[PDB]
Design a protein that fits this description.
This protein starts with 10 loop residues before the first strand and ends with a strand. The strands form eleven sheets. An eight-stranded parallel beta sheet has the order 13-12-11-5-2-1-15-14. Strands 26, 28, 29, 32, 33 and 34 form a six-stranded mixed beta sheet that branches. The chain has a four-stranded antiparallel beta sheet with strand order 16-17-18-24. The chain has four domains: 401 residues, TIM Barrel; 94 residues, Golgi alpha-mannosidase II (Immunoglobulin-like, Sandwich), CATH 2.60.40.1180; 82 residues, Immunoglobulins (Immunoglobulin-like, Sandwich); 108 residues, Immunoglobulins (Immunoglobulin-like). The protein is α+β, with helices and mostly antiparallel strands. It has 13 helices and 41 strands. Helices cover 20% and strands 29% of the residues. Bound molecules: a molecule of 2 linked components (GLC-GLC) (4 copies) and calcium ion (3 copies). The site of one calcium ion has 7 residues, from loops. The PDB classes it as hydrolase. Keywords: amylase, glycoside hydrolase, starch degradation, hydrolase. The assembly is monomeric.
């Protein structure tokens, strides 16, 4: 379906309470009375935006070029205050994952918005927050709701009556946010003076409950999810949850793995997650550099190109990275740099670069504001004539129509500290983009080379951002002047004469799932699709999109190929799992002594466990881990494995110097749980 890939889309991120109040009657419900501020002066209270308000502004969003709305969390949040004028208006403090937040509407309202968005050709992804329930103080159960969790109104438990349930972790507050065990098993804290009750995704009831709640959003039409705080809960559950969701529908998943940029200690773990979990990630690596290049001017275009190259080498599916200039957790771009041309340039960069852009609501209306909560002001106007509105609409159309933006390679063609001219290319489709961030200097551009075919090219933006026309002859662009602060875009597209795969999505699943192949040149007459040479059953076949069912074949990463008119396409990978997954805590007791830098990994006889690999790079299906060691010399971590299956596995130490020390003896043998979760505990064999 169209939900599988968002490569041709523009994502628009909406903080529901601060967008549009389409129904004033749900502003201050009796269920959660007293959390509403009609004056819009108390920044952490509900101001009244809702799901009906989003639905009423669909014509505006369609005209802007939005093709996927990322809705901030829609599920029932804390019904009380959490300290002085502080409320769950943002949606990250969930008390009931089965019900829509009453300030925003009910399930009928959600269905109506989603159905109306789909009628307007716009998808809806939902921000889903599995890490925690609500604010609590460990020494006082009367604060807020004490972390209370409900199941469609039926009370489940809170932080204080959990002794015989184990729905929450009880390990204290995070102290070192970069310590992986703390970041996942200790509590998320808020500087306002409280902690968030940390759900135990290792508890079977909670894992199935969260799975059911995510599946319910998809059953109600959601086209995918933006999964909150994926660095804060075990990554086995991210992969097992993604499995369940792709069994339901070929939706799109992206996880927010905050920070951990290149060169940092936990960066490789984030890359491995993006490459193996079945969940794509938001592009924090590129965001940092975009803000320093176009915002603070502390980095240059060389740093921007270096980050495009570095992310391109690390992420297997870099075209699934979700890019952004700002969001609800950092100051708005215009509070970093109020120059609107620099904002226009940053927007053009993400609109034409690899991955799919996410534009934070109101960017196109020139909203400004410091960090949370001041970057969550009310959408001020719905003016369709701003330069930013016109730019986004125009470039969104280029992204929908030119395959080079969706799937293309990226090549640097001209660069200095201020100017970046890069080229996207997908077979014969080419887009050459020139950006000059310096608003006070023009540059003479000579020696520019391109893959554009011969001819004269007008700026696709029609000079909106100061762009100019160019003349191309045998791969050479005639010398021209790039104006101060300008953005200029030159493009070529044509029909394909052979099958060309731009995307296969989702990137993981089991036999029988629906998988979508997006591209060009498939023809109108049905041809064939193979996975590793195995013929797949075709569900639908069009010139640019094929839907297939994953064949009942052996598990592992395999190559998808399209054959049309006797000619075969390029290959694109797809990870076939060994069966529906379960998320399992693997513990190895009494392992041998280690030194700082030495880490233990798990490997075994299935692709989920690496097929006996000892490789620990960003590759797909290699050794699993590393394990953590809060209970050293015992080590543990949580991994997604096929449910109800007998597996063989061993652990190994990867010393700081790269040396490998395997457990001795015979392989450990175990049968995995049949439910959502379970535990497999063994003793290191000496
Ligand atoms: O109470 C802590 C914090 O909760 C929310 O922050 C989110 C953030 O917006 C997400 O993007 C991610 O980083 O996880 C956090 C917890 O879900 C609120 O948005 C923030 O105001 C509040 O301080
Ligand atoms: O002519 C091919 C050459 O083009 C570009 O080099 C630019 C350089 O980026 C600018 O800073 C300036 O010095 O003009 C040069 C062209 O004369 C590419 O960046 C380079 O890779 C390529 O070889
Ligand atoms: O390479 C496949 C092989 O991997 C594992 O064998 C390990 C063994 O456990 C270690 O003790 C040491 O001998 O290295 C071997 C890998 O070279 C599995 O145990 C074995 O079943 C599997 O075939
Ligand atoms: O400031 C709120 C954010 O806190 C955390 O961010 C951590 C980050 O994970 C860690 O890598 C860095 O070293 O420290 C910061 C701040 O303590 C959360 O992970 C974010 O989601 C929050 O927005
Ligand atoms: Ca309202
Ligand atoms: Ca509520
Ligand atoms: Ca957690």
């Amino acid at each position: 379906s169209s939900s599988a890939s968002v490569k041709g889309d523009v994502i628009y991120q909406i903080i529901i309470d601060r967008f549009y109040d389409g129904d004033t009657t749900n502003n201050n419900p009796a269920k959660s009375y007293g959390l509403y501020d009609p004056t819009k002066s108390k920044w952490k209270m509900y101001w009244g935006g809702d799901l009906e308000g989003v639905r009423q502004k669909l014509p505006y969003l369609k005209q802007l070029g939005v093709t996927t709305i990322w809705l901030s969390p829609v599920l029932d949040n804390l019904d009380t205050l959490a300290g002085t004028d502080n409320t769950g208006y943002h949606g990250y403090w969930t008390r009931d994952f089965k019900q829509i937040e009453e300030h925003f509407g009910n399930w009928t309202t959600f269905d109506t918005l989603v159905n109306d968005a789909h009628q307007n050709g716009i998808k809806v992804i939902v921000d889903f927050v599995p890490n925690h329930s609500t604010p609590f103080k460990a020494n006082d159960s009367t604060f807020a709701e004490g972390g209370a969790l409900y199941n469609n109104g039926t009370y489940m438990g809170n932080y204080f009556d959990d002794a015989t349930k184990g729905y929450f972790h009880h390990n204290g507050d995070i102290s070192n946010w970069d310590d992986r065990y703390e970041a996942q098993w200790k509590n998320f804290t808020d500087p306002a003076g409280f902690s968030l009750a940390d759900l135990s995704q290792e508890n079977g009831t909670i894992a199935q409950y969260l799975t059911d709640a995510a599946v319910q959003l998809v059953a109600h039409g959601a086209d995918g999810l933006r999964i909150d705080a994926v660095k804060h809960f075990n990554s086995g559950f991210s992969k097992s949850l993604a499995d369940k969701l792709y069994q339901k529908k070929d939706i799109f998943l992206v996880g927010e793995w905050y920070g951990d940029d290149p060169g940092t200690a936990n960066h490789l773990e984030k890359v491995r997650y993006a490459n193996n979990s079945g969940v794509n990630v938001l592009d924090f690596d590129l965001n940092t550099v975009i803000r320093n290049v176009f915002g603070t001017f502390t980095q240059t275009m060389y740093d921007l190109n270096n980050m495009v190259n570095q992310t391109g080498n690390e992420y297997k599916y870099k075209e699934n990275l979700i890019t952004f200039i700002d969001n609800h957790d950092m100051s708005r771009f215009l509070s970093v740099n109020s120059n609107k041309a620099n904002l226009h340039q940053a927007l053009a960069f993400i609109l034409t670069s690899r991955g799919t852009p996410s534009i934070y609501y109101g960017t196109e209306q020139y909203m400004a504001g410091g960090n949370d909560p001041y970057n969550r002001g009310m959408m001020p106007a719905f003016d369709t004539t701003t330069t930013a509105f016109k730019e986004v609409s125009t470039l969104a159309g280029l992204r929908r129509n030119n395959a080079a933006i969706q799937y293309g390679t990226t090549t640097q063609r001209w660069i200095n500290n201020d100017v970046y001219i890069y080229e996207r290319k997908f077979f014969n489709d080419v887009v050459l983009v020139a950006i000059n961030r310096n608003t006070q200097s023009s540059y003479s551009i000579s020696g520019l080379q391109t893959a554009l075919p011969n001819g004269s090219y007008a700026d696709y933006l029609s000079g909106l951002l100061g762009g100019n026309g160019i003349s191309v002859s045998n791969g050479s662009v005639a010398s021209f002047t790039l104006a101060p602060g300008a953005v200029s875009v030159w493009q070529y597209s044509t029909s394909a004469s052979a099958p060309q795969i731009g995307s296969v999505a989702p990137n993981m699943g089991i036999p029988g799932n629906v998988v979508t192949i997006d591209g060009k040149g498939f023809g109108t007459t049905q041809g064939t699709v193979t996975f590793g040479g195995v013929t797949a059953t075709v569900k639908s076949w069009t010139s640019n999109r094929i839907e297939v069912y994953v064949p009942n074949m052996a598990a592992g990463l395999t190559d998808v190929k399209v054959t049309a008119g006797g000619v075969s396409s390029n290959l694109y990978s797809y990870n076939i799992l060994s069966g529906t997954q379960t998320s399992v805590v693997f513990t190895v007791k009494s392992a041998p002594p280690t030194n700082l830098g030495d880490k233990i990994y798990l490997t075994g006889n299935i692709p989920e466990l690496g097929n006996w690999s000892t490789d620990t790079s960003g590759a797909v299906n290699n050794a699993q881990g590393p394990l953590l060691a809060p209970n050293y010399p015992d080590w543990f971590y949580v991994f997604s494995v096929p449910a109800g299956k007998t597996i063989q596995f061993k652990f190994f130490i990867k010393r700081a110097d790269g040396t490998i020390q395997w457990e001795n003896g015979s392989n450990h043998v175990a049968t995995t749980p049949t439910g959502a979760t379970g535990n497999i505990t063994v003793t290191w064999q000496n």
